[PDB]
């Protein structure tokens, strides 16, 4: 806790959605959007496997469809924009050891753990899956995590999977291991 507002405890990350009518070309553009205003909607990101869909995430009900099982936690239904994206933050339970992400996305994204980038695509792209380099966790427990992802338009998908076993199996980040505050969710 770091202010005077109690924070919701749930098995997920704290999600924020931002839309814009400017072009998002890269991570910097999306982070600047996040900095520029209050979120257009908030949600609980408890099953981080979104899309795929078409015809712009920021239009109509496409965000709801993209978020799927998480859309019932939306604070509002945003109005139309051309471009948009999400900012997720909270905690993930990981034992000490080596891990790596494998992420399918359109457009780009950045994932950080304990403040260090561990999976980055700093550009727009049609759907593509990257196997990212491995990283280490020094101490078992809840690790800080954040993610950004955006859609510049067109198709959209975001599925960042994680392997604990050297790339032999991967899992989606979901309510089994996510925490919004770092306390244990029940
Ligand atoms: O290559 C850009 C070109 O492809 C289209 C096809 O619909 O968009 C694709 O590529 C974009 C990244 O440049 C993705 O954002 C998009 O989702 C994907 O459909 C066109 O919009 C543009 O012709
Ligand atoms: Ca607080
Ligand atoms: Ca903001
Ligand atoms: Ca809408
Ligand atoms: Ca879905
Ligand atoms: Ca739901
Ligand atoms: Ca655009
Ligand atoms: Ca796109």
Residue numbers in the entry: 5 to 190
Passage from the reporting paper:
MpPA14 (Marinomonas primoryensis PA14 domain) lectin is a domain of a 1.5-MDa adhesin responsible for a symbiotic bacterium-diatom interaction in Antarctica. Bioinformatic analyses indicated the presence of an ∼20-kDa domain near the C terminus of MpIBP that is a member of the PA14 family, which is a carbohydrate-binding lectin module widely distributed across several kingdoms of life. PA14 domains share a β-sandwich fold and the presence of two consecutive aspartate residues in a cis peptide linkage (DcisD). The DcisD motif coordinates a Ca2+ ion that is directly involved in binding polar vicinal hydroxyl groups of various carbohydrates.
Glucose, GlcNAc, and other glucopyranose-containing carbohydrates, including 2-deoxy-glucose, methyl-α-glucose, and two disaccharides (sucrose and trehalose), all bound to the Mp-PA14-Ca1 via their trans vicinal 3,4-diols (ionic bond length, 2.5 Å) in gauche configuration with a dihedral angle of ∼60°. This interaction is further enhanced with the diol being coordinated by the side chain carboxyl and hydroxyl oxygens of the DcisD motif, and main-chain and side chain protein ligands from L11 (Gln156, Gly157, and Asp159).
